[PDB]
Amino acid sequence: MTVKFLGAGTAACIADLITFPLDTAKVRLQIQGESQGLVRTAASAQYRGVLGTILTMVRTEGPRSLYNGLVAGLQRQMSFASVRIGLYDSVKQFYTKGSEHAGIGSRLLAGSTTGALAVAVAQPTDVVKVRFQAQARAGGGRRYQSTVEAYKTIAREEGIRGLWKGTSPNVARNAIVNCAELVTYDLIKDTLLKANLMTDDLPCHFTSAFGAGFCTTVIASPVDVVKTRYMNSALGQYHSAGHCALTMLRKEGPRAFYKGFMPSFLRLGSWNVVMFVTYEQLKRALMAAYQSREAPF
User: Where do the record's region annotations for Important for interaction with long-chain fatty acids lie?
Assistant: First the structure.
């Protein structure tokens, strides 16, 4: 029997499949900071052709190479649903709690405090997975490396700071969305939430949302746009976020933002599909009252 957990359960499975091949395209689409000098002797060896690159990976190691690690990708997906067994109900009940006739500020403080606290317990899996994909050229040294082995060796040469590279901005990312969320969230409550679902015309409310849906996405786009600009560089003399603001005003007019934005746009098409799958469940749900009735009683 299906349910909300399993509906979500079906959700996590489809989204990463059509999205995993996406990462390989972004990195190739780079001037190749490798500059190993290999590029100048041969400035090609990999056309934009996305069909081309995916073909290249299997013949690189072998067919067993695509099915090797396959068990590791799922476990990625395995933990997301498991944590939502507690961190979902927990931050969620922390922000929508009845209350009395206010507490919007309280919710910011509860949400800001709890979320920051939550990253505290879980985080190492998220940092390693991006870094893990980056560790390239298969892997030699008789015994094949692993997650436990992978974390420690780069840490010896690179240190803690190497590791925090993503950790610090990730926390910042959480704050802005929530910050963005409270301003945004107010708007959803006003429509169709004046007294929570109080109409038999279910199809009517949905159509209102879609038209509404396109308008919200434009609001959604800005967090995505700023991220791509970064690509302009990597590593240097950037102490914290604030150094960018002083630097940006002095050099590189605000026009630089308008230019360079092809990756995010590409992200937007793929990113758009993931929201759609949740909508699909809403479109097609369970269908048996007696079955649903028996579970809660």
Answer: 4-51, 266-273
CB 273 within 8 Å of CB 204: no
Per DSSP, the chain holds a count of helices (H) and strands (E) of 15, 0
- What is the per-residue DSSP string for 174-201? HHHHHHHHHHHHHHHHHTTTTTTS--S-
For 262-271, the CB contacts below 8 A with 24+ separation are 262/228, 263/26, 263/29, 263/228, 263/231, 264/224, 264/225, 264/227, 264/228, 266/25, 266/26, 267/22, 267/224, 267/228, 268/221, 268/224, 270/18, 270/19, 270/22, 271/224
What is the Cα 123 distance to its own chain's centre? 14
* Structural domain range at position 1: 1-297
Q: Which two tokens stand for residue 26?
A: 């972004």
Report how far residue 219's alpha carbon sits from residue 217's, in angstroms, rounded to the nearest whole number: 5
Measured between alpha carbons, how far is residue 171 from residues 35, 113, 128, 138, 274 in Å? Answer: 32, 12, 16, 31, 23
Q: In the structure encoding, which two tokens stand for residue 7, read together? A: 């509906």
Where does residue 47 rank: exposed (0-12), middle (13-18), buried (19+ CB within 10 A)?
exposed
CATH number of the domain enclosing 132: 1.50.40.10
End-to-end CA distance of the chain: 16
Burial degree of 129 (CB within 10 A; 0-12, 13-18, 19+): middle
- The single-letter DSSP state of residue 65 is G
Residue 115: count other Cβ atoms within 10 Å of its Cβ: 19
- Rounded distance, CA 296 to CA 293, Å? 6
* The token pair that represents 28 in the structure block: 């190739």
Which of 15, 16, 39, 17 is CA-nearest to residue 28?
Answer: 39
Instruction: Give the number of domains in the chain.
Output: 1
Could you tell me the two tokens for 272?
Answer: 């758009």
Q: Which pair of tokens denotes residue 211?
A: 């038209």
Breaks (C–N over 2.5 Å) after residues, the chain: none
Residue identified by tokens 């791509």 is 228
